[PDB]
Write a protein that binds this DNA or RNA. Structure first.
Ligand SMILES: Nc1ccn([C@H]2C[C@H](O)[C@@H](COP(=O)(O)NP(=O)(O)OP(=O)(O)O)O2)c(=O)n1
Ligand SMILES: [Mg+2]
Ligand SMILES: [Mg+2]
Length: 430
DNA sequence: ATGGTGACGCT
DNA sequence: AGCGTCAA
Protein backbone atom coordinates (compact mmCIF):
# COMPACT_ATOMS: atom_id res chain seq x y z
CA UNK A 1 0.00 0.00 0.00
CA UNK A 2 1.95 3.01 1.42
CA UNK A 3 5.34 1.63 0.28
CA UNK A 4 4.58 0.35 -3.21
CA UNK A 5 5.97 2.79 -5.77
CA UNK A 6 3.60 3.69 -8.58
CA UNK A 7 6.07 5.14 -11.07
CA UNK A 8 4.42 8.55 -10.94
CA UNK A 9 7.43 10.67 -9.96
CA UNK A 10 8.27 12.14 -13.38
CA UNK A 11 6.51 13.85 -16.27
CA UNK A 12 7.93 12.58 -19.59
CA UNK A 13 6.85 13.51 -23.11
CA UNK A 14 7.71 12.06 -26.46
CA UNK A 15 7.45 14.27 -29.55
CA UNK A 16 7.29 12.42 -32.89
CA UNK A 17 7.10 14.43 -36.12
CA UNK A 18 4.29 13.51 -38.49
CA UNK A 19 5.33 11.87 -41.78
CA UNK A 20 8.57 13.70 -41.29
CA UNK A 21 10.49 13.38 -44.55
CA UNK A 22 7.28 14.11 -46.46
CA UNK A 23 6.70 17.29 -44.45
CA UNK A 24 10.27 18.38 -45.17
CA UNK A 25 9.63 17.96 -48.91
CA UNK A 26 6.17 19.56 -48.71
CA UNK A 27 7.57 22.66 -47.00
CA UNK A 28 10.07 23.00 -49.82
CA UNK A 29 7.60 22.25 -52.63
CA UNK A 30 4.12 23.69 -52.01
CA UNK A 31 2.79 21.61 -54.90
CA UNK A 32 3.12 18.53 -52.69
CA UNK A 33 1.12 19.99 -49.81
CA UNK A 34 -2.20 18.31 -48.90
CA UNK A 35 -1.64 15.62 -51.51
CA UNK A 36 -1.07 11.91 -51.48
CA UNK A 37 2.69 11.85 -51.71
CA UNK A 38 5.74 9.89 -50.68
CA UNK A 39 9.49 10.22 -50.41
CA UNK A 40 11.44 7.74 -52.49
CA UNK A 41 15.09 6.80 -52.97
CA UNK A 42 16.79 5.50 -56.16
CA UNK A 43 14.38 5.95 -59.09
CA UNK A 44 15.80 3.24 -61.35
CA UNK A 45 14.69 0.14 -59.44
CA UNK A 46 10.90 0.11 -59.75
CA UNK A 47 10.40 3.87 -59.35
CA UNK A 48 12.39 3.83 -56.15
CA UNK A 49 11.89 2.60 -52.60
CA UNK A 50 9.34 4.47 -50.49
CA UNK A 51 10.66 5.60 -47.10
CA UNK A 52 7.91 8.04 -46.00
CA UNK A 53 4.24 8.48 -46.84
CA UNK A 54 1.73 11.31 -46.35
CA UNK A 55 -1.48 10.56 -44.56
CA UNK A 56 -3.48 11.18 -47.74
CA UNK A 57 -1.40 8.49 -49.45
CA UNK A 58 -1.74 6.07 -46.48
CA UNK A 59 -5.54 6.17 -47.08
CA UNK A 60 -4.87 4.37 -50.37
CA UNK A 61 -2.73 1.71 -48.66
CA UNK A 62 0.65 3.14 -49.57
CA UNK A 63 3.30 2.11 -47.05
CA UNK A 64 6.98 2.38 -46.37
CA UNK A 65 9.15 -0.24 -48.18
CA UNK A 66 6.81 -0.41 -51.14
CA UNK A 67 8.40 0.15 -54.53
CA UNK A 68 6.95 3.34 -55.96
CA UNK A 69 5.85 1.47 -59.11
CA UNK A 70 3.76 -0.74 -56.84
CA UNK A 71 2.46 2.16 -54.77
CA UNK A 72 1.24 3.76 -58.02
CA UNK A 73 -0.99 0.73 -58.55
CA UNK A 74 -2.85 1.62 -55.32
CA UNK A 75 -2.64 5.39 -55.76
CA UNK A 76 -2.24 6.38 -59.42
CA UNK A 77 -2.09 10.08 -58.58
CA UNK A 78 0.64 9.61 -55.92
CA UNK A 79 3.20 12.42 -55.98
CA UNK A 80 6.82 11.72 -55.24
CA UNK A 81 9.83 13.54 -53.93
CA UNK A 82 13.30 11.95 -54.31
CA UNK A 83 16.07 11.75 -51.76
CA UNK A 84 19.14 13.66 -52.89
CA UNK A 85 21.85 11.53 -54.47
CA UNK A 86 25.48 12.60 -54.12
CA UNK A 87 28.65 10.66 -54.89
CA UNK A 88 26.51 7.77 -56.13
CA UNK A 89 24.39 7.31 -53.01
CA UNK A 90 21.32 8.57 -51.19
CA UNK A 91 22.19 11.51 -48.98
CA UNK A 92 20.04 12.33 -45.97
CA UNK A 93 21.45 15.77 -45.17
CA UNK A 94 18.26 17.70 -45.79
CA UNK A 95 16.40 15.63 -43.21
CA UNK A 96 19.22 15.73 -40.69
CA UNK A 97 19.24 19.55 -40.97
CA UNK A 98 15.46 19.74 -40.61
CA UNK A 99 15.77 17.53 -37.53
CA UNK A 100 18.25 20.01 -35.99
CA UNK A 101 15.63 22.79 -36.52
CA UNK A 102 13.10 20.88 -34.45
CA UNK A 103 15.49 19.65 -31.78
CA UNK A 104 16.83 23.16 -31.17
CA UNK A 105 13.28 24.49 -30.59
CA UNK A 106 12.44 21.63 -28.22
CA UNK A 107 15.66 22.27 -26.27
CA UNK A 108 14.34 25.73 -25.32
CA UNK A 109 11.71 24.06 -23.16
CA UNK A 110 13.73 21.25 -21.59
CA UNK A 111 16.83 19.15 -21.97
CA UNK A 112 16.10 16.60 -24.70
CA UNK A 113 17.00 13.05 -25.60
CA UNK A 114 17.32 12.70 -29.38
CA UNK A 115 15.74 9.32 -29.86
CA UNK A 116 15.82 9.39 -33.64
CA UNK A 117 15.90 11.81 -36.56
CA UNK A 118 12.33 12.91 -35.76
CA UNK A 119 11.67 11.85 -32.13
CA UNK A 120 12.79 13.36 -28.86
CA UNK A 121 11.94 12.66 -25.22
CA UNK A 122 11.80 15.43 -22.65
CA UNK A 123 11.62 15.25 -18.90
CA UNK A 124 9.18 18.02 -17.94
CA UNK A 125 9.12 17.31 -14.18
CA UNK A 126 10.99 20.53 -13.33
CA UNK A 127 9.17 22.71 -15.84
CA UNK A 128 5.84 21.44 -14.47
CA UNK A 129 6.81 22.25 -10.90
CA UNK A 130 7.72 25.77 -12.00
CA UNK A 131 4.51 26.27 -13.97
CA UNK A 132 2.45 24.97 -11.01
CA UNK A 133 3.90 27.80 -8.91
CA UNK A 134 3.04 30.43 -11.51
CA UNK A 135 -0.33 28.68 -11.61
CA UNK A 136 -1.21 29.93 -8.12
CA UNK A 137 -3.81 27.19 -7.71
CA UNK A 138 -6.01 28.41 -10.58
CA UNK A 139 -7.87 25.73 -12.60
CA UNK A 140 -6.63 24.56 -15.96
CA UNK A 141 -8.84 25.66 -18.85
CA UNK A 142 -9.73 23.25 -21.68
CA UNK A 143 -8.64 26.13 -23.92
CA UNK A 144 -5.03 25.45 -22.92
CA UNK A 145 -5.33 21.86 -24.25
CA UNK A 146 -6.80 22.35 -27.76
CA UNK A 147 -5.27 19.21 -29.31
CA UNK A 148 -5.05 16.91 -26.26
CA UNK A 149 -6.71 13.49 -25.90
CA UNK A 150 -7.12 11.93 -22.49
CA UNK A 151 -6.66 8.19 -23.02
CA UNK A 152 -9.58 6.16 -21.66
CA UNK A 153 -12.03 9.09 -21.62
CA UNK A 154 -14.88 9.76 -22.05
CA UNK A 155 -16.30 6.91 -20.04
CA UNK A 156 -19.56 6.16 -18.24
CA UNK A 157 -23.22 7.28 -18.38
CA UNK A 158 -22.01 12.71 -30.14
CA UNK A 159 -20.61 10.81 -33.12
CA UNK A 160 -17.76 12.99 -34.29
CA UNK A 161 -14.15 12.79 -33.35
CA UNK A 162 -13.45 16.22 -31.99
CA UNK A 163 -16.68 16.00 -30.03
CA UNK A 164 -15.44 12.89 -28.24
CA UNK A 165 -12.06 14.52 -27.61
CA UNK A 166 -13.67 17.41 -25.82
CA UNK A 167 -16.02 15.22 -23.77
CA UNK A 168 -13.08 13.19 -22.53
CA UNK A 169 -11.03 16.28 -21.77
CA UNK A 170 -13.97 17.79 -19.86
CA UNK A 171 -14.41 14.66 -17.70
CA UNK A 172 -10.70 14.73 -16.97
CA UNK A 173 -10.45 18.38 -16.02
CA UNK A 174 -13.66 18.21 -13.96
CA UNK A 175 -12.15 15.52 -11.75
CA UNK A 176 -8.74 17.17 -11.23
CA UNK A 177 -7.50 18.16 -7.74
CA UNK A 178 -5.84 21.51 -8.48
CA UNK A 179 -4.95 22.39 -4.88
CA UNK A 180 -2.48 19.52 -4.68
CA UNK A 181 0.89 20.39 -6.26
CA UNK A 182 2.03 16.79 -5.78
CA UNK A 183 -0.91 15.17 -7.63
CA UNK A 184 0.54 13.11 -10.48
CA UNK A 185 -2.56 13.61 -12.64
CA UNK A 186 -2.31 17.36 -12.20
CA UNK A 187 1.43 17.20 -13.03
CA UNK A 188 0.63 15.31 -16.26
CA UNK A 189 -2.00 17.88 -17.14
CA UNK A 190 0.42 20.78 -16.72
CA UNK A 191 2.91 18.73 -18.72
CA UNK A 192 0.32 18.53 -21.51
CA UNK A 193 -0.14 22.34 -21.43
CA UNK A 194 3.61 22.77 -21.88
CA UNK A 195 3.67 20.25 -24.73
CA UNK A 196 0.85 22.18 -26.47
CA UNK A 197 3.12 25.24 -26.25
CA UNK A 198 6.12 23.26 -27.51
CA UNK A 199 4.21 21.79 -30.45
CA UNK A 200 2.81 25.23 -31.34
CA UNK A 201 6.37 26.63 -31.33
CA UNK A 202 7.61 23.86 -33.57
CA UNK A 203 4.82 24.41 -36.10
CA UNK A 204 5.09 28.21 -36.03
CA UNK A 205 8.88 28.24 -36.44
CA UNK A 206 9.32 25.37 -38.89
CA UNK A 207 6.00 24.66 -40.57
CA UNK A 208 6.17 21.07 -39.34
CA UNK A 209 3.36 19.32 -37.46
CA UNK A 210 3.93 16.62 -34.86
CA UNK A 211 2.22 14.38 -32.35
CA UNK A 212 3.18 13.86 -28.73
CA UNK A 213 2.57 11.60 -25.77
CA UNK A 214 2.62 12.75 -22.14
CA UNK A 215 2.95 10.25 -19.33
CA UNK A 216 5.22 9.24 -16.42
CA UNK A 217 7.90 7.41 -18.41
CA UNK A 218 9.28 6.91 -21.88
CA UNK A 219 7.44 3.73 -22.81
CA UNK A 220 4.05 5.16 -21.91
CA UNK A 221 4.82 8.52 -23.54
CA UNK A 222 5.80 6.75 -26.76
CA UNK A 223 2.73 4.52 -26.70
CA UNK A 224 0.59 7.58 -25.92
CA UNK A 225 2.03 9.53 -28.85
CA UNK A 226 0.87 7.00 -31.44
CA UNK A 227 -2.68 6.77 -30.11
CA UNK A 228 -3.91 9.91 -31.86
CA UNK A 229 -1.23 10.75 -34.39
CA UNK A 230 -1.26 12.88 -36.52
CA UNK A 231 -1.26 16.45 -35.26
CA UNK A 232 -2.61 15.58 -31.80
CA UNK A 233 -1.18 14.81 -28.38
CA UNK A 234 -2.29 12.21 -25.88
CA UNK A 235 -2.10 12.04 -22.08
CA UNK A 236 -1.83 8.54 -20.59
CA UNK A 237 -2.32 8.66 -16.83
CA UNK A 238 -1.18 6.02 -14.40
CA UNK A 239 -4.82 5.14 -13.77
CA UNK A 240 -5.43 4.53 -17.49
CA UNK A 241 -2.89 1.71 -17.65
CA UNK A 242 -4.92 -1.35 -16.57
CA UNK A 243 -7.57 -0.83 -19.24
CA UNK A 244 -5.11 0.32 -21.89
CA UNK A 245 -2.86 -2.66 -21.33
CA UNK A 246 -5.69 -5.20 -21.06
CA UNK A 247 -6.00 -5.45 -24.86
CA UNK A 248 -2.56 -4.08 -25.86
CA UNK A 249 -0.51 -6.56 -27.86
CA UNK A 250 2.85 -7.09 -26.24
CA UNK A 251 4.71 -6.17 -29.48
CA UNK A 252 3.43 -2.61 -29.30
CA UNK A 253 5.61 -1.75 -26.31
CA UNK A 254 8.99 -0.35 -27.26
CA UNK A 255 11.75 -3.03 -27.10
CA UNK A 256 9.18 -5.84 -27.27
CA UNK A 257 8.56 -5.69 -31.00
CA UNK A 258 11.16 -8.35 -31.83
CA UNK A 259 12.38 -11.77 -30.60
CA UNK A 260 12.11 -11.01 -26.87
CA UNK A 261 8.49 -9.99 -27.20
CA UNK A 262 7.78 -13.06 -29.29
CA UNK A 263 9.39 -15.19 -26.61
CA UNK A 264 7.19 -13.52 -23.96
CA UNK A 265 4.11 -14.53 -25.94
CA UNK A 266 5.33 -18.05 -26.68
CA UNK A 267 6.76 -19.02 -23.34
CA UNK A 268 4.02 -17.53 -21.17
CA UNK A 269 1.09 -18.19 -23.49
CA UNK A 270 -0.29 -14.66 -23.33
CA UNK A 271 -1.11 -11.96 -25.84
CA UNK A 272 -1.55 -8.65 -24.04
CA UNK A 273 0.69 -6.51 -21.87
CA UNK A 274 -1.74 -6.52 -18.95
CA UNK A 275 -1.55 -10.29 -18.71
CA UNK A 276 2.05 -10.00 -17.49
CA UNK A 277 0.78 -8.86 -14.05
CA UNK A 278 -0.04 -12.44 -13.14
CA UNK A 279 3.62 -13.51 -12.94
CA UNK A 280 5.99 -12.88 -10.07
CA UNK A 281 9.12 -10.87 -10.64
CA UNK A 282 11.20 -14.03 -10.09
CA UNK A 283 9.14 -15.93 -12.63
CA UNK A 284 9.73 -13.23 -15.24
CA UNK A 285 13.44 -13.07 -14.39
CA UNK A 286 13.65 -16.81 -14.73
CA UNK A 287 12.40 -16.72 -18.33
CA UNK A 288 13.85 -13.48 -19.61
CA UNK A 289 16.82 -12.68 -17.41
CA UNK A 290 17.33 -10.51 -14.36
CA UNK A 291 17.22 -7.18 -16.22
CA UNK A 292 14.39 -7.99 -18.64
CA UNK A 293 12.37 -9.75 -15.93
CA UNK A 294 12.43 -6.78 -13.53
CA UNK A 295 11.74 -4.42 -16.42
CA UNK A 296 8.69 -6.43 -17.51
CA UNK A 297 7.37 -6.79 -13.95
CA UNK A 298 7.36 -3.03 -13.54
CA UNK A 299 6.39 -2.12 -17.10
CA UNK A 300 3.18 -4.15 -17.16
CA UNK A 301 2.12 -2.07 -14.13
CA UNK A 302 2.94 1.19 -15.98
CA UNK A 303 6.26 1.66 -14.16
CA UNK A 304 9.60 2.30 -15.87
CA UNK A 305 12.75 3.99 -14.68
CA UNK A 306 14.72 4.59 -17.91
CA UNK A 307 15.84 8.23 -17.67
CA UNK A 308 15.52 10.89 -20.36
CA UNK A 309 19.19 11.17 -21.23
CA UNK A 310 20.68 14.61 -21.81
CA UNK A 311 21.80 13.98 -25.40
CA UNK A 312 20.79 16.24 -28.28
CA UNK A 313 23.36 15.08 -30.83
CA UNK A 314 23.98 11.75 -32.54
CA UNK A 315 26.87 9.73 -31.00
CA UNK A 316 27.95 8.35 -34.37
CA UNK A 317 28.15 9.61 -37.95
CA UNK A 318 27.81 6.80 -40.46
CA UNK A 319 27.76 6.26 -44.21
CA UNK A 320 26.31 3.04 -45.62
CA UNK A 321 25.79 1.62 -49.10
CA UNK A 322 24.38 -1.67 -50.32
CA UNK A 323 25.26 -3.27 -53.62
CA UNK A 324 22.42 -5.65 -54.39
CA UNK A 325 22.38 -8.47 -56.92
CA UNK A 326 24.57 -7.87 -59.93
CA UNK A 327 25.87 -4.54 -58.61
CA UNK A 328 28.04 -6.26 -55.98
CA UNK A 329 31.63 -5.09 -55.99
CA UNK A 330 33.86 -7.58 -57.74
CA UNK A 331 36.99 -5.57 -58.51
CA UNK A 332 39.53 -3.90 -56.28
CA UNK A 333 39.11 -0.60 -58.11
CA UNK A 334 35.37 -0.77 -57.44
CA UNK A 335 35.89 -1.42 -53.76
CA UNK A 336 38.39 1.43 -53.62
CA UNK A 337 36.19 3.85 -55.57
CA UNK A 338 33.18 3.27 -53.34
CA UNK A 339 35.17 3.42 -50.10
CA UNK A 340 36.33 6.85 -51.28
CA UNK A 341 32.78 7.95 -52.11
CA UNK A 342 31.66 7.00 -48.60
CA UNK A 343 34.74 8.52 -47.02
CA UNK A 344 34.14 11.78 -48.85
CA UNK A 345 30.58 12.08 -47.57
CA UNK A 346 31.80 11.12 -44.10
CA UNK A 347 34.54 13.74 -44.24
CA UNK A 348 32.05 16.40 -45.21
CA UNK A 349 29.71 15.52 -42.37
CA UNK A 350 32.57 15.21 -39.89
CA UNK A 351 34.03 18.60 -40.72
CA UNK A 352 30.63 20.28 -40.35
CA UNK A 353 30.06 18.39 -37.10
CA UNK A 354 33.40 19.51 -35.68
CA UNK A 355 32.72 23.15 -36.53
CA UNK A 356 29.17 23.10 -35.17
CA UNK A 357 29.60 20.94 -32.11
CA UNK A 358 33.20 21.27 -30.84
CA UNK A 359 34.11 17.62 -30.89
CA UNK A 360 36.20 15.23 -32.94
CA UNK A 361 35.65 11.56 -33.72
CA UNK A 362 38.56 9.30 -32.80
CA UNK A 363 37.56 5.89 -34.10
CA UNK A 364 36.61 4.73 -37.60
CA UNK A 365 34.44 1.62 -37.89
CA UNK A 366 34.54 -0.30 -41.18
CA UNK A 367 31.89 -2.90 -41.95
CA UNK A 368 31.26 -5.01 -45.03
CA UNK A 369 29.00 -7.78 -46.25
CA UNK A 370 30.23 -10.43 -48.66
CA UNK A 371 27.87 -11.94 -51.22
CA UNK A 372 26.39 -15.15 -49.87
CA UNK A 373 26.97 -14.39 -46.21
CA UNK A 374 23.79 -14.91 -44.18
CA UNK A 375 24.91 -12.34 -41.60
CA UNK A 376 24.29 -8.65 -42.31
CA UNK A 377 27.94 -7.91 -41.61
CA UNK A 378 30.74 -10.28 -42.65
CA UNK A 379 33.25 -8.16 -40.76
CA UNK A 380 33.07 -5.10 -38.51
CA UNK A 381 36.44 -3.77 -37.46
CA UNK A 382 37.84 -0.53 -36.08
CA UNK A 383 40.97 1.49 -36.63
CA UNK A 384 42.14 4.92 -35.52
CA UNK A 385 40.53 8.05 -36.96
CA UNK A 386 43.34 10.53 -36.62
CA UNK A 387 42.63 12.92 -39.52
CA UNK A 388 39.45 14.17 -41.21
CA UNK A 389 40.74 13.19 -44.63
CA UNK A 390 38.69 11.12 -47.06
CA UNK A 391 41.61 9.55 -48.92
CA UNK A 392 43.22 8.54 -45.63
CA UNK A 393 40.00 7.16 -44.19
CA UNK A 394 39.27 5.20 -47.40
CA UNK A 395 42.82 3.92 -47.56
CA UNK A 396 42.63 2.86 -43.89
CA UNK A 397 39.27 1.18 -44.42
CA UNK A 398 40.78 -0.75 -47.31
CA UNK A 399 43.65 -1.87 -45.13
CA UNK A 400 41.40 -3.29 -42.44
CA UNK A 401 39.28 -5.27 -44.95
CA UNK A 402 41.85 -6.18 -47.66
CA UNK A 403 42.19 -9.74 -46.36
CA UNK A 404 38.61 -10.74 -47.08
CA UNK A 405 39.55 -10.82 -50.75
CA UNK A 406 40.12 -14.58 -51.15
CA UNK A 407 40.65 -14.14 -54.88
CA UNK A 408 44.13 -15.43 -55.68
CA UNK A 409 44.26 -12.61 -58.20
CA UNK A 410 44.08 -9.49 -56.03
CA UNK A 411 42.82 -7.48 -59.02
CA UNK A 412 39.55 -9.32 -58.55
CA UNK A 413 37.51 -9.24 -55.38
CA UNK A 414 35.78 -12.42 -54.17
CA UNK A 415 33.29 -13.07 -52.89
CA UNK A 416 31.87 -9.78 -54.21
CA UNK A 417 30.93 -7.17 -51.60
CA UNK A 418 27.24 -6.41 -51.16
CA UNK A 419 27.64 -3.68 -48.52
CA UNK A 420 30.19 -1.09 -47.42
CA UNK A 421 29.84 0.91 -44.19
CA UNK A 422 32.03 3.62 -42.65
CA UNK A 423 31.23 5.06 -39.26
CA UNK A 424 32.91 7.72 -37.12
CA UNK A 425 32.64 7.04 -33.37
CA UNK A 426 34.14 7.79 -29.94
CA UNK A 427 33.90 11.57 -29.91
CA UNK A 428 36.16 13.75 -27.74
CA UNK A 429 35.75 17.46 -27.01
CA UNK A 430 37.63 19.78 -29.38
C1' DA B 1 16.33 -5.92 -54.54
C1' DT B 2 14.23 -1.80 -49.37
C1' DG B 3 18.16 1.21 -47.88
C1' DG B 4 20.27 4.53 -44.95
C1' DT B 5 20.62 5.15 -40.91
C1' DG B 6 21.46 5.06 -35.18
C1' DA B 7 21.42 3.51 -29.67
C1' DC B 8 22.40 0.05 -26.53
C1' DG B 9 23.19 -5.02 -24.72
C1' DC B 10 26.24 -9.29 -24.37
C1' DT B 11 30.48 -12.03 -23.62
C1' DA C 1 36.21 -5.48 -29.21
C1' DG C 2 32.99 -7.49 -32.54
C1' DC C 3 28.49 -8.89 -32.98
C1' DG C 4 23.49 -8.84 -32.11
C1' DT C 5 18.78 -6.72 -31.19
C1' DC C 6 15.70 -3.22 -31.80
C1' DA C 7 14.37 0.86 -33.60
C1' DA C 8 13.44 5.49 -36.97
N1 LIG D 1 12.39 2.25 -41.67
C1 LIG D 1 12.42 3.66 -41.71
C2 LIG D 1 11.64 4.41 -40.74
C3 LIG D 1 11.70 5.86 -40.80
N2 LIG D 1 12.49 6.47 -41.79
C4 LIG D 1 12.57 7.89 -41.84
C5 LIG D 1 11.38 8.50 -42.71
C6 LIG D 1 10.47 8.92 -41.81
O1 LIG D 1 9.70 10.09 -42.27
C7 LIG D 1 11.27 9.32 -40.56
C8 LIG D 1 10.59 9.18 -39.33
O2 LIG D 1 10.15 7.85 -39.07
P1 LIG D 1 8.74 7.51 -38.47
O3 LIG D 1 8.46 8.33 -37.30
O4 LIG D 1 8.80 6.01 -38.20
N3 LIG D 1 7.60 7.70 -39.66
P2 LIG D 1 6.99 9.16 -40.17
O5 LIG D 1 7.50 10.36 -39.39
O6 LIG D 1 7.20 9.26 -41.66
O7 LIG D 1 5.40 9.03 -39.97
P3 LIG D 1 4.52 9.12 -38.63
O8 LIG D 1 3.81 7.75 -38.55
O9 LIG D 1 5.46 9.36 -37.49
O10 LIG D 1 3.55 10.23 -38.82
O11 LIG D 1 12.47 8.34 -40.61
C9 LIG D 1 13.25 5.71 -42.74
O12 LIG D 1 13.91 6.27 -43.60
N4 LIG D 1 13.19 4.28 -42.69
MG1 LIG E 1 7.48 10.36 -37.14
MG1 LIG F 1 9.51 8.71 -35.20
Amino acid sequence: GPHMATGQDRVVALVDMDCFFVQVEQRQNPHLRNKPCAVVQYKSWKGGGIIAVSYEARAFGVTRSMWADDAKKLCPDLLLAQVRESRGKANLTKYREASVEVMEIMSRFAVIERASIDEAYVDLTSAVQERLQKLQGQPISADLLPSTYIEGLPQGPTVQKEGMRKQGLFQWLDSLQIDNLTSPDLQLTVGAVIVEEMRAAIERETGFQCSAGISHNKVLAKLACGLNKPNRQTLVSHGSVPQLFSQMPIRKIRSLGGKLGASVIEILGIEYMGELTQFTESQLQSHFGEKNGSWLYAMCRGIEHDPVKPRQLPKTIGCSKNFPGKTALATREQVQWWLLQLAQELEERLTKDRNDNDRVATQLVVSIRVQGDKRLSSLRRCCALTRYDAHKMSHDAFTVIKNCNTSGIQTEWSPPLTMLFLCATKFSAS
